[PDB]
Amino acid sequence: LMNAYENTQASESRIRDADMAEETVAFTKNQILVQSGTAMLAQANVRPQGVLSLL
């Protein structure tokens, strides 16, 4: 029973428990992309300002 408990716990951890080192990279990638997207959105917000000179 002890051996079976150990093996079953190992399997359950394998198929459910997250690997922190596996998606820490994904999290950092996602926040970097968020920063890039917000920078691009800020840049594109002021884009139509160039037409005001023609008025």
Binding site: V25, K29, S36
Partner: protein, 57 residues
């Protein structure tokens, strides 16, 4: 440089996973005190060792 996929991080994590697997194997070998432990490490050795244990008893 491409930021959609940190390939260096992927490679480092790939190496780290197998290094941790070997670490766990070594830790279990240390804790049990036996080289064979579960099967697959040396099947022939395990079979012979079981035979010798029966002979000892």
């Amino acid at each position: 440089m491409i930021i959609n996929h940190n390939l260096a991080a992927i490679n480092s994590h790939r190496v780290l996973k197998f290094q941790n697997e070997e670490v766990s194997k070594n830790m279990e070998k240390l804790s049990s005190g036996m080289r064979i432990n579960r099967a697959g490490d040396d099947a022939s050795g395990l079979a012979v060792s079981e035979k010798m244990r029966t002979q000892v008893n």
